[PDB]
Paper text:
Pum is a founding member of the Pum/fem-3 mRNA-binding factor (FBF), or PUF family, of eukaryotic RBPs. Pum binds with high affinity to specific sequences in target mRNAs and represses protein expression and enhances mRNA degradation. Regulation of hb mRNA by Pum relies on the spatial distribution of Nos, a tandem CCHC Zn finger (ZF) RBP. Here, we report the crystal structures of Nos-Pum-RNA complexes, which reveal that Nos acts as a molecular clamp that embraces both Pum and RNA.
The Cyclin B (CycB) NRE contains a PRE that diverges from the consensus with uracils in place of adenines at positions +6 and +8, and it has a different NBS sequence. Pum alone did not form a stable complex with CycB NRE RNA (left, and 6B), but remarkably, addition of Nos ZC resulted in ternary complex formation with an apparent Kd of 12 nM (right, and 6B), similar to the 8.7 nM Kd for hb NRE2. The protein structures are essentially unchanged compared to the complex with hb NRE2 RNA; however, differences in Pum binding to bases +5 to +8 result in distinct conformations of hb and CycB RNAs in this region. In contrast, Pum appears to bind to the CycB PRE using the 1 repeat:1 RNA base PUF recognition mode with R1271Pum sandwiched between bases +4 and +5. However, for the CycB RNA, recognition of +6U is suboptimal and the +8U nucleotide is disordered in the ternary complex. Thus, Nos stabilizes binding of Pum to RNAs that do not match the PRE consensus sequence in the 3´ half, reducing Pum specificity to allow regulation of a broader range of mRNA targets than Pum alone. Nos and Pum recognize their respective NBS and PRE elements; however, Nos recognition of the 5´ NBS and clamp-like binding to Pum and RNA relaxes the sequence requirements of Pum interaction with the 3´ end of the PRE, as with CycB mRNA, which effectively shifts the recognition sequence, rather than extending it.
Residue numbers in the entry:
A (entry chain B): 316 to 384
B (entry chain A): 1092 to 1102, 1121 to 1418
Write the structure that this text describes.
RNA sequence: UAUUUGUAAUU
């Protein structure tokens, strides 16, 4: 494989997809596009970077939070 | 004799044990009784062997059962010591499927009330499961009676949940029932746990329908809250699949009344989308079409993700 | 544009 998935889902050119793997060998984030992105919730970036949908602090939403908003 | 060890190394050792394994199917029964009688002395130490245990396992089948019994007696008196030992317990669990059920019952009577510190070992749990599969469940009533007050605390245990599934799969109604009610007590907290979801999941695809009705009734109100949770999302998954049409319709109508943006939380969140997917392929075309015409707009927010729906 | 889809103890 030797290829990332994050760059593949964003339709980056075929060389960038095969350029790097998604993460490191130590579960460190490796894809530069993901390491750039600073999490708007938990603020982490780089080694522990992640998007919003997968943030550890992405709050659990009850029906009450769906009524009030 | 070690000069022949280095005269065969030049061509308890892996070579000798595996060659015993590949040539035990040949040779004479006189050599079989020869070796077996050469082992009966102090096999208590030969159990805890990294590759003697391959040999013990291999001989527990090809020989006459007389050797199985006579070596069986050369073990009792030291079972609490050899059950926690790795190779000894590989020997045990690889030996509980060859002996007679009577000697088996003797082994069951060897350890009672010990379950506490048994499954709480890296090796005891595997043997416990192997016995719940092998031994008659009625002989294991000491297991059911060693868990009064200990069901909820050990059902979330990693080694405990396996044993729980083995009990629920290989028992009668009188044995599965009290533990099952003990599970019906602490359900709402079991689902949230990383190992309670294995237990409940095993219940939904094994137990009687009525338990599934009780559990499904103990969920109506927590669909968005648990589909958004990490472990509970699997309970929702393997819950909507195994269900009657009436309960599928009940939960489906409980979901399609979500406040629009809650549907966006469903499609977006890292877990609820699995609930959506496995919810698609169980519904009747009536409720299926009543859901296609419900969250069709939110679809236009998944073409950027990895959902080709 | 924030896009990767998600859980289990031993030779
Ligand atoms: Zn990348
Ligand atoms: Zn974050």
């Amino acid at each position: 494989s030797r290829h990332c998935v994050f760059c593949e889902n964003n339709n980056e050119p075929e060389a960038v997809i095969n350029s790097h793997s998604v993460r490191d060998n130590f579960n460190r984030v490796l894809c530069p596009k993901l390491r750039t992105y600073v999490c708007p919730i938990c603020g982490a970036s780089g080694d522990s970077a992640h998007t919003i949908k997968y943030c550890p602090k992405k709050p659990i939403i009850t029906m009450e939070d769906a009524i009030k908003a | 004799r070690s000069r022949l060890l280095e005269d065969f190394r030049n061509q308890q050792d892996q070579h000798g044990s595996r060659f015993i394994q590949q040539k035990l199917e040949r040779a004479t029964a006189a050599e079989k009784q020869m070796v077996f009688s050469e082992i009966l002395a102090a096999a208590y130490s030969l159990m805890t062997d990294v590759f003697g245990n391959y040999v013990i396992q291999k001989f527990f089948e090809f020989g006459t059962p007389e050797q199985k019994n006579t070596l069986g007696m050369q073990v009792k008196g030291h079972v609490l010591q050899l059950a926690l030992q790795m190779y000894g317990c590989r020997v045990i669990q690889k030996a509980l499927e060859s002996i007679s059920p009577e000697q088996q019952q003797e082994i069951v009577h060897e350890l009672d009330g010990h379950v506490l510190k048994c499954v709480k070992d890296q090796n005891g749990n595997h043997v416990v499961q192997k016995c719940i599969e092998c031994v008659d469940p009625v002989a294991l009533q000491f297991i059911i009676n060693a868990f009064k007050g200990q069901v909820y605390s050990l059902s979330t245990h990693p080694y405990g949940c396996r044993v729980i599934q083995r009990i629920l799969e290989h028992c009668t109604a009188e044995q599965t029932t009290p533990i099952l009610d003990e599970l019906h007590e602490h359900t709402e907290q079991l689902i949230q746990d990383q190992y309670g979801n294995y237990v409940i999941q095993h219940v939904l695809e094994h137990g009687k329908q009525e338990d599934k009705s009780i559990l499904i009734n103990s969920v109506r109100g927590k669909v968005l809250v648990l589909s958004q949770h990490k472990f509970a999302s699997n309970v929702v998954e393997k819950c909507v699949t195994h269900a009657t049409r009436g309960e599928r319709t009940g939960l489906i109508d409980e979901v399609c009344t979500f406040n629009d943006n809650a549907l966006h939380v469903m499609m977006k969140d890292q877990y609820a989308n699995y609930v959506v997917q496995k919810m698609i392929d169980v519904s009747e075309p009536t409720q299926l079409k009543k859901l296609m015409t419900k969250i069709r707009p939110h679809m236009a927010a998944l073409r950027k993700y990895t959902y080709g729906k």
